[PDB]
Design a protein around this ligand. Structure first.
Ligand SMILES: OC[C@H]1O[C@@H](O[C@H]2[C@H](O)[C@@H](O)[C@H](O[C@@H]3[C@@H](O)[C@H](O[C@H]4[C@H](O)[C@@H](O)[C@H](O)O[C@@H]4CO)O[C@H](CO)[C@H]3O)O[C@@H]2CO)[C@H](O)[C@@H](O)[C@@H]1O
Ligand SMILES: [Ca+2]
Ligand SMILES: [Ca+2]
Ligand SMILES: [Cl-]
Length: 131
């Protein structure tokens, strides 16, 4: 089941990005202007992970030219949970949902996202239990 949908713009701390209106389905905002080394923290909204095992993490992303990469991690930078490439969608507001599985320990987590490479926008993240 879905543990949580986290809107990208609901970060508690960030470095180097900016919010903008999104035209994706449902409206609201996206995080843009993401460059290599930029980061977002969700430490202000802890997410309880009910059991140790596999979780499918989904990212609602847009990218004009491609080349982007992110790491899904614990806020602060360690441990790291996984990395995923962001494909080109051909527009800054042409959206798609990408997916990877990570393995998480049970308990209270504070998540963060680090941009390894830029060129992508983020609308929201969804964390799913798949074990
Ligand atoms: O890897 C070496 C390179 O590091 C670059 O700087 C990194 C830095 O080493 C790394 O620790 C940092 O991780 C951030 C982390 O600082 C930040 O912590 C937040 C926290 O989430 C927030 O809740 C709290 O309020 O404030 C903290 C900041 O004081 O969390 C994010 C998300 O988890 C982490 O990615 O990131 C830096 C930038 O990439 C150097 O710039 C480079 O010179 C060096 O070679
Ligand atoms: Ca930036
Ligand atoms: Ca959003
Ligand atoms: Cl970059």
């Amino acid at each position: 089941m879905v543990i949580a949908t986290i809107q990208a713009e609901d970060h508690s701390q960030q470095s180097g990005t900016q919010q903008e209106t999104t035209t994706d389905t449902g409206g609201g905002k996206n995080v843009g202007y993401i460059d290599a080394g930029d980061w977002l923290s969700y430490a202000g909204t802890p997410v309880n992970i009910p059991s140790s095992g596999s979780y499918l993490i989904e990212y609602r992303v847009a990218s004009q030219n491609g080349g982007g990469s992110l790491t899904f991690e614990e806020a602060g930078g360690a441990p790291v949970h996984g990395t995923i490439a962001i494909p080109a969608t051909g527009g800054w507001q042409t959206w798609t949902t990408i997916q990877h599985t990570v393995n998480l320990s049970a308990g209270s987590h504070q998540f963060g996202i680090k941009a390894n490479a830029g060129g992508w926008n983020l609308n929201w993240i969804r964390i799913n239990k798949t074990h």
